[model samples]
Target: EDVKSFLRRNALLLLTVLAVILGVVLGFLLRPYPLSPREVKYFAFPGELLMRMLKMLILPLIVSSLITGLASLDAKASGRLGMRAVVYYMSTTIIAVVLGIILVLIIEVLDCFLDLARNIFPSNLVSAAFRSYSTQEVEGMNILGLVVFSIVFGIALGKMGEQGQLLVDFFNSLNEATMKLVAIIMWYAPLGILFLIAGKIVEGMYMVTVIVGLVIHGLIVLPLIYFLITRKNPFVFIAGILQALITALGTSSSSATLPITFKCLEENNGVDKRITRFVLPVGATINMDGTALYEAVAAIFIAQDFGQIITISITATAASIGAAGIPQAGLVTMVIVLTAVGLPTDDITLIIAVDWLLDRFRTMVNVLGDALGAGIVEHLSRKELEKQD
Candidate 1:
């Protein structure tokens, strides 16, 4: 059942990988015909359409998804166990964002942060639908503003108790509708991807770049935070949760991995159940370190085809905040981020070409983040737990 489920659940991921392999060969094979004047534009049509369709979902996906997601989770967790892990989550996410934008310099921070601020708080809500605030504008969703607004509304809606149920259900259903749309579009992705990779015969340091951030964050950056906090060797902490990590690798969704995550934190690492249960799920929604890095790197890489010291940081940060698991929410939010910087949606094929490998790794980082936060909170609240027990 487990093997079958893994295979069943991962069909799209594996199919996409197969597409990557076939694409390269197809690229090589087709070189003879296009060898004259056939050119890549015609060959990659399915891909262009794929990008367009994926992008089409961006506006609805961002609004409904963000508002619905933030509205669902409550405020009590935003307290102590809340704030502690949140700091870890935010710090790591920022590190990932910085590493994603690592390609730039000090003056680079100037336009970038300015625009990110503009993205966070748009001047006009209606204009935010199509134009984020920048030097008179670019035409894409005001993603970060939508993100902030959605979170604000999400919290406000949740706080309204029973009264907000009507609006809540509306946004939630809207989010589901968007996901169903994405599920269908994602099914179209492999076919488009095969041709896209074939059309361009694209290979990039972009893959290397995104993965490098993963290794650095997972190994050097995350571990050090663990060590500095508890003064324990973080690798030992990681070792205790080995099963959970590998499970995270396969399932590739933090929420799905939650069962095994709780098992390892309590059974393997001996974390207090109260802390693990409370802290783990909080991280799932907002602990987006790896997701941020991948989007930032991809967005910046896509922008390189154009020109801008743009707001990759803001988009990555905003997109990752309301992160969820269902019908591949990542890519829709991905379309949202890349477009915010005025990057072409079609260009994401390079990253999507190998998203399978990247996604599994991304899941591991998120799980690791949640687990470590649980461990720290276990220590911090030990005296309190002792009191209650």
Candidate 2:
């Protein structure tokens, strides 16, 4: 009766779980066979479609979410909320660094920070939507730039008082539409997730199936951090967000998982919208604990020449800030970590071999960190929130 109640309540979540199990079962079916490239593409089509659909929602979602969320808050409340979030996220990351170092960079590394600073103040807002500064101004969604822009735009709208309400209403409507679109996309999530899990099941893909540091951080350290601070049952809190967690595993990109996460936090977990709307975007972009931990472990795994542990730890954490929240995105940040320690960048090859699986786990941890950090911040700011309305 109890299991049936869970199934009835979360049919989509159950379907998503089954999809992963089925995909795994089928993935090994052809593990020994040599499948052609075209066949692999066919198998991955549904997955890619899901990815495309999720990414399609991200730009609109971020812009409208921030624009409306910030515009609603008194500028004072938003800043206080943001400060609480930052302190909590930074605290967890420092813990992640400590955990990783117990288990487990210089000049060229500075280049990554320079590029990050440049991207924050992009020359062209329109160009910034699709480009960010790098060695020579790389092409991609300048998520950092977009984030900065949205944040500033939202703050200014909030400052405008009466005039802002007009645009705020407009963005609120856009947010609603995008949310509805996300709901429709989730209806297709099970199918897409099935193939996504199946496509990764070829031979040699089991380079690393589990990670000790990550497992410790995700299962124990993170929950305890939440438990000690909030006195809430962390696992119960985690249970509220299971659907988001499974989607993160299948998608392997928290950027792609944001829509589902928002739904879970707001509707299921009942995290305040004012908190999630602001924190989730910022957290997804810059606050990645799993990436920080994994990068520390990976850099330690790659380099034996071992520089100052303190320097390497700081650089790994910094590198994660610049990492985009997309599939295998943390890999790019490895160069900065190795460079900071003055180790050979060539060893990223070895790291990549294990990353195929670790990335998914890292993403799960990253999303969880973001989720938990949001909860902690909301808890800490209860007084300020009470004063707001």
Candidate 3:
């Protein structure tokens, strides 16, 4: 029995390594084949399914988690802790944006890049043309508004008190239901990743240069910088965040990733329960470092494709940072950035297409950034707890 259990444990590790290898190898091997429309459609199904699953749960996840987190605290603690979380999340998100923009500018990755597959893209400009109509969409949808709305929404839902117990019970049940739904999706993750890898492989694609740059930026650059800031081994901290990364990938919604983010902070990385419980839920709603970086990268790519030069300046960097913390705020902010520099908004469509492909990976990084913040907070909280003791 001991040997059997040992083998079972080792098997999971073996399979995980094999899965990673298989994904990379398969994607590379399949790159030579031109995927038929039918094949593309088939491969796209899982991603679509995952996206729909995420969309379905996003609202309820935000609402229930917000209410639960708020209700967990008394008024004074909630106010104090909430303020701290906001400040920290905002600060970190701005930092992330700056990091992203600086990286993009320093790399000058947009120069000499060509999109050879422009013919493969759809010709309709209606979507691209509509950018002007939704200029404030990103700004209007910031995390502060979401939290305020969630609290107000939850309170309104809870007005029945004992009578509203039924509604609360319903939302409570719904939360559990959504989590179960997430669990079900997780079970199929290997398959979904498999398809995503296979599709990438079959495209016979020129390995995108900016994507390669992003890999170097994220895996190498970010960790080194983070360690310098926090004085800890970022890799060790990242290991603790694996679960949150997986959950964020499967859900593709940082708001939905909040619960797992909190769990990882408390259980894996030894963050103080009070701070983890207090800060991350709020950060999930507002802190969007990963998305912020992605917006800068995407915008830079669009500008490159259109032969536009973005004069880098402190103001532009600050605007990108300010834009980073907003919810679903990437495209609009990118448009604003582009327009401010006299670039055309029409290229947004091309950028959006790639963003759909890139969102999962970027979101995984965002969740990791959240975990990093949680680790820093945890480190501080531990000292406070020990001092009190």
Top candidate by TM-score: 2
Model 3 scores a TM of 0.64
Q: Assess every candidate by TM-score.
A: 0.55, 0.94, 0.64
Any runs in candidate 2 off by more than 4 Å, and if so which? Answer: 105-110, 203-210, 304-307
Error of 2 at 247 (Å): 1.3
lDDT of each: 0.67, 0.83, 0.54
Model 2 over residues 48-163: C-alpha lDDT tens digits? 99999988898888888898888878888888888888787787888887778777421066777788889888899888877778868787777778888888889999999889
lDDT of 3: 0.54
Candidate 2 to truth, TM? 0.94
Q: Which is better, 1 or 2, measured by lDDT?
A: 2
The Cα RMSD of model 2 versus the native structure comes to: 3.1
- What global local distance difference test value does model 1 have? 0.67
lDDT of 3 by residue, 59-153 (tens): 55555655654443444545555565566566655555556555556551131011112211313323322121121221122333444555654
Total clashing residue pairs per candidate? Answer: 0, 3, 4
How many steric overlaps does candidate 2 have? 3
